[PDB]
């Protein structure tokens, strides 16, 4: 259930690109190629996937999520069957870069833990058009489940997970009406903010949600806003007081203090947010509460006559929480270890790898350990000659 805002309001980051396959690539066998682009702002971006320099058709996109620091995520993926000589790339156009960036494919909560709900709301003012584009994405445990997009010919909240088909029409009508309210709220706020910062594209973001534990009781609630991808105002953990990021947001804070806005959101986070997440978790039991254990292996990458890189892979796991660690004769090497952010592999599962540089001839004294709730015991494995 989406939040409902009350009183209104009173820079570029270059993307990071990762290109990888869902399964270990075998020539002539079906697979999925992923292009995972993160940490960029503004959200507008153009992504193409290439095979031998040719645009690949029917590329799917997971759109319009963002992280705690307000920078945007996107996942582009397409099924493909690789062969030995083909070359594959991902080409990204973003306003933070002078020219397009091409990255080539190198062939070398959830479950039983805590749970959370989030609504990621973004309005972007467009120069050639009147109204801003307003998008709302709802998430349960890293899984998109609802979406509203004002660029739709008939804008409406739509189900994005199969267990939301269960909700009757009055649910969708009620959520959609909230979205239209939010759209007006964001539109007038964008106009106020343009004056407040004395400006002449612009972005306004909201993130709201509740965190639950394993007992499914409220751990913490959030309600935070950003302008131009930078903190503006956030509701503190007490759900009573506000933290303002600059002098403009201080004016908004005192206005929202006079009007008791914090209590309106406190009631949503403590009651509605918690109770309907419970229902979503139970309706989506088979999907959200499953555990898929990781399959793990170690690869060998010589770099000179004296040194080699060992990379510990974990594939096909759900939920996303996982711990990869390297050890040398029993003691852990976390400080001198190279990791990659846990990444989605395009089918509901996730991937991660961790690497160390070791002297050639001592590979057998290094061990990788994998911790995952889907594993009855932690996995221990080492490079196999
Ligand atoms: C999920 O479904 C199974 C089978 O229907 C049931 O036994 C289990 O208790 C359910 N889990 C939760 C958390 O509702
Ligand atoms: C390293 O590996 C070898 C091979 O098993 C072993 O003999 C040795 O005790 C291990 N540990 C150290 C500290 O050398």
UniProtKB/Swiss-Prot annotation:
Ranges per topology, Extracellular: 113-385
Gene Ontology, cellular component aspect: external side of plasma membrane; lumenal side of endoplasmic reticulum membrane; MHC class I protein complex; phagocytic vesicle membrane; plasma membrane
Principal location listed in the UniProt entry: membrane
Subcellular location: Membrane
Gene Ontology biological-process annotations: antigen processing and presentation of endogenous peptide antigen via MHC class I via ER pathway, TAP-dependent; negative regulation of neuron projection development; positive regulation of T cell mediated cytotoxicity; T cell mediated cytotoxicity
PTM annotation, UniProt: Polyubiquitinated in case of infection by murid herpesvirus 4, by the viral E3 ligase K3 (mK3). This modification causes the protein to be targeted for rapid degradation by the endoplasmic reticulum-associated degradation (ERAD) system. Ubiquitination occurs on lysine, as well as serine and threonine residues present in the cytoplasmic tail. Serine and threonine residues are subject to ubiquitination via ester bonds instead of the usual isopeptide linkage.
Entry-listed glycosylation sites: 198, 285, 365
Disulfide bond residue pairs: 210-273, 312-368
UniProt-annotated stretches for the region Alpha-3: 292-383
UniProt keyword terms in alphabetical order: Disulfide bond, Glycoprotein, Immunity, Membrane, MHC I, Phosphoprotein, Signal, Transmembrane, Transmembrane helix, Ubl conjugation
Region (Alpha-1): 113-200
UniProt topology in membrane: Single-pass type I membrane protein
Subunit-level organization: Heterodimer of an alpha chain and a beta chain (beta-2-microglobulin). Interacts with murid herpesvirus 4 protein K3 (mK3).
Protein's UniProt name: H-2 class I histocompatibility antigen, D-B alpha chain
Organism per entry: Mus musculus (Mouse)
Record lineage: Eukaryota, Metazoa, Chordata, Craniata, Vertebrata
